Design an enzyme around this catalytic site. Structure first.
Site, mmCIF file in Angstrom:
data_model
loop_
_atom_site.group_PDB
_atom_site.id
_atom_site.type_symbol
_atom_site.label_atom_id
_atom_site.label_comp_id
_atom_site.label_asym_id
_atom_site.label_seq_id
_atom_site.Cartn_x
_atom_site.Cartn_y
_atom_site.Cartn_z
ATOM 1 N N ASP A 10 5.119 -2.865 9.194
ATOM 2 C CA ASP A 10 5.742 -2.479 7.932
ATOM 3 C C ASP A 10 7.236 -2.094 8.101
ATOM 4 O O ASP A 10 8.085 -2.494 7.313
ATOM 5 C CB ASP A 10 4.956 -1.322 7.306
ATOM 6 C CG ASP A 10 3.496 -1.677 7.019
ATOM 7 O OD1 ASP A 10 3.198 -2.882 6.864
ATOM 8 O OD2 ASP A 10 2.640 -0.742 6.977
ATOM 9 N N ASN A 29 1.909 -11.391 12.465
ATOM 10 C CA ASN A 29 1.590 -11.103 13.851
ATOM 11 C C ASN A 29 0.833 -12.325 14.383
ATOM 12 O O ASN A 29 0.558 -13.267 13.623
ATOM 13 C CB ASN A 29 0.840 -9.762 14.019
ATOM 14 C CG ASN A 29 -0.460 -9.694 13.241
ATOM 15 O OD1 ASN A 29 -1.108 -10.711 12.979
ATOM 16 N ND2 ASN A 29 -0.836 -8.489 12.850
ATOM 17 N N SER A 65 0.780 -1.209 0.000
ATOM 18 C CA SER A 65 0.000 0.000 0.000
ATOM 19 C C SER A 65 0.836 1.297 0.000
ATOM 20 O O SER A 65 2.029 1.311 0.321
ATOM 21 C CB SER A 65 -0.900 -0.022 1.230
ATOM 22 O OG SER A 65 -1.334 1.287 1.533
ATOM 23 N N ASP A 122 5.065 -10.434 4.327
ATOM 24 C CA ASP A 122 4.380 -9.974 5.490
ATOM 25 C C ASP A 122 2.892 -10.135 5.155
ATOM 26 O O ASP A 122 2.368 -9.399 4.317
ATOM 27 C CB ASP A 122 4.778 -8.528 5.792
ATOM 28 C CG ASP A 122 4.219 -8.050 7.082
ATOM 29 O OD1 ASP A 122 3.670 -8.891 7.813
ATOM 30 O OD2 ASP A 122 4.279 -6.837 7.355
HETATM 31 N N1 ATP Z 1 3.016 -0.991 21.830
HETATM 32 C C1 ATP Z 1 3.431 -1.617 20.706
HETATM 33 N N2 ATP Z 1 2.623 -1.729 19.631
HETATM 34 C C2 ATP Z 1 3.011 -2.349 18.502
HETATM 35 N N3 ATP Z 1 4.227 -2.902 18.353
HETATM 36 C C3 ATP Z 1 5.138 -2.866 19.350
HETATM 37 C C4 ATP Z 1 4.784 -2.206 20.617
HETATM 38 N N4 ATP Z 1 5.858 -2.310 21.428
HETATM 39 C C5 ATP Z 1 6.820 -2.979 20.739
HETATM 40 N N5 ATP Z 1 6.386 -3.305 19.499
HETATM 41 C C6 ATP Z 1 7.178 -4.045 18.484
HETATM 42 O O1 ATP Z 1 6.676 -3.861 17.153
HETATM 43 C C7 ATP Z 1 6.652 -5.114 16.461
HETATM 44 C C8 ATP Z 1 5.487 -5.196 15.480
HETATM 45 O O2 ATP Z 1 4.267 -5.258 16.212
HETATM 46 P P1 ATP Z 1 3.112 -6.301 15.814
HETATM 47 O O3 ATP Z 1 3.671 -7.694 15.945
HETATM 48 O O4 ATP Z 1 1.870 -5.937 16.586
HETATM 49 O O5 ATP Z 1 2.893 -5.970 14.253
HETATM 50 P P2 ATP Z 1 1.508 -5.386 13.661
HETATM 51 O O6 ATP Z 1 0.386 -5.795 14.582
HETATM 52 O O7 ATP Z 1 1.461 -5.778 12.203
HETATM 53 O O8 ATP Z 1 1.729 -3.789 13.725
HETATM 54 P P3 ATP Z 1 0.967 -2.712 12.778
HETATM 55 O O9 ATP Z 1 -0.426 -3.261 12.611
HETATM 56 O O10 ATP Z 1 1.045 -1.457 13.620
HETATM 57 O O11 ATP Z 1 1.758 -2.663 11.491
HETATM 58 C C9 ATP Z 1 6.562 -6.186 17.538
HETATM 59 O O12 ATP Z 1 7.340 -7.339 17.204
HETATM 60 C C10 ATP Z 1 7.101 -5.531 18.790
HETATM 61 O O13 ATP Z 1 8.400 -6.034 19.106
#
Ligand code: ATP
Ligand code: ATP
Lengths: 277, 277
Positions: free
Chosen positions: A217, A140, A11, A117
């Site tokens: 991302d 995730n 995106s 991803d």
């Molecule tokens: N409060 C937080 N929110 C999100 N990520 C965090 C936070 N604190 C640390 N992280 C780090 O960011 C990385 C990515 O987060 P996550 O696994 O939730 O991916 P995601 O849900 O796809 O994030 P997004 O939807 O914001 O792109 C995690 O592996 C984590 O180590």
């Protein structure tokens, strides 16, 4: 330092840091030539009162790709990175985009690394078909649960989810987090072939309250970049560190200011232990 | 360092360094938050056997802009940068995009700087209408000749061309080159108002044989960046230097490798004298 070419299919938003805008700068900062395909071109990410813009059709994708193929650009990608696509036909088409590149590369004795991803309908079934072609996947916990059929609640379930990915062909699996409360734990699982023993690693990062847009991302982009000359476990640790510092820097669902902190992306200082199991 | 927000309205290619891909990285390297509107999303620039991709319609532009306006993003741009658009209705629409931003900014006592790179049909007439709203314009000699009606052959004609721009309202005019043979000469002309005396500067850069794609796009981006805290004459000198070093770096119509030389973009070392007349 070596061949640092990436085709990044994600995106694009005019405002905010998500998708290709979020991925491209960290990669360029690490010396990568990023060829971008913007699967959508929207005004902003979710969260705002209003979202508008254009969504790529199958016809448009195919037409773009005619030029890319005709001009022999496919032979010169060392990496393919996919992010948010949400279109059955196109994520379905990426199977082909990936396969054209891999054969082109193999015939000239060069490598290809596909980092998927799996950002998440009928899109699920399509991802189940695409993920087997990935060298690295970065789900995730929700995406790992959806793809594998196993609810990723903790380490044990994370491991069963990761096994599903290895079984369908994926060598490197990172399940980026699951939530004893004040920390997030991650799992890295590697299996270099059918007749290869699986090795697992786990580590933690401090949990920070609130939501931060574009973390996944930026993580994937940094993982790619750091994986180029660091072992994967070290690369995961450095990527986790980049995010940890960026999330702290914005504490002084809001944006990561990567552009304000380029030395954090290049040289994270926080240490994340990626410990073998 | 201060408010470093830019709305950049230009072309986008998957492969190569032109348009928004060429502009965005240098700006980000200098700390700028770049909000991009991609007026086209093509496979590559001209030169290749084949070019394909999508061209933004008026409807799409307007629809994108609804979101951008509705979410109050227009109030937070300190800069507007326009490049390659080639669409009478949209370059025609940018007059409006510019005017919405300027009034929003003025009402909150903040500034706006519009840098127009008039990249060049009925598009000419439309540019004649848009350029008067620019604070800075960066025509090559051909574009200065087309807009002004005066063929820009040398310094004297370059000056008459630049006068045309001041007369229609433009404070800062850079005519980026004209060709005693082994050098390119440029003109910077500034007139801070109807009842303001014009001052001119000129300098030279070594001419390098061959064609190099995206030079104008990178120049404009660097000019914006360097203009933020350097006087304009110094900013022009540093921008000319960036290009001069990048064009030499690719000598070791082909791409500038900006990503390979980030310290050149941040800190050019070559000195270009921008000498008053
Ligand atoms: N409060 C937080 N929110 C999100 N990520 C965090 C936070 N604190 C640390 N992280 C780090 O960011 C990385 C990515 O987060 P996550 O696994 O939730 O991916 P995601 O849900 O796809 O994030 P997004 O939807 O914001 O792109 C995690 O592996 C984590 O180590
Ligand atoms: N051989 C060269 N070709 C192009 N530009 C050069 C060359 N050598 C130096 N330059 C610098 O690059 C700047 C931009 O070039 P020019 O004025 O031709 O813009 P342009 O024609 O719009 O370029 P492009 O079409 O490649 O974007 C010039 O001001 C000049 O100082």
């Amino acid at each position: 330092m070596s061949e640092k070419t990436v085709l990044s299919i994600q995106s694009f938003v005019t405002h905010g840091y998500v998708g290709n805008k979020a991925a491209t700068f960290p990669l360029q900062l690490h010396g990568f030539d990023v060829d971008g395909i913007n699967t959508v071109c929207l005004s902003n990410h979710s969260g705002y009162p209003v979202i508008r813009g254009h969504r790529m059709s199958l016809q448009e994708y195919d037409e773009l790709m005619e030029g890319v193929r005709a001009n022999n650009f496919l032979s010169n990608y060392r990496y393919i990175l996919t992010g948010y696509i949400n279109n059955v036909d196109i994520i379905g088409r990426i199977r082909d985009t990936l396969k054209e590149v891999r054969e082109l590369r193999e015939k000239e004795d060069k490598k290809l690394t596909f980092i998927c991803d799996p950002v998440m309908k009928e899109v699920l079934d399509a991802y189940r078909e695409l993920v087997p072609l990935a060298d690295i996947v970065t789900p995730n916990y929700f995406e790992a649960s959806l793809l594998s059929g196993v609810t990723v609640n903790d380490l044990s379930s994370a491991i069963l989810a990761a096994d599903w990915f290895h079984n369908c062909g994926v060598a490197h699996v990172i399940i980026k987090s699951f939530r004893n409360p004040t920390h997030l734990r991650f799992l890295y699982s590697v299996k270099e072939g059918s007749e290869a023993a699986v090795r697992r690693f786990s580590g933690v990062v401090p949990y920070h309250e609130g939501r931060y847009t574009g973390t996944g991302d930026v993580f994937a982009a940094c993982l790619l970049a750091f994986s180029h000359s660091h072992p994967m476990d070290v690369a995961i640790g450095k990527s986790m560190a980049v995010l940890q510092e960026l999330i702290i820097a914005t504490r002084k669902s809001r944006e990561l200011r990567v552009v304000a902190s380029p030395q954090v992306v290049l040289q994270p200082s926080t240490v994340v232990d990626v410990k073998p199991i």
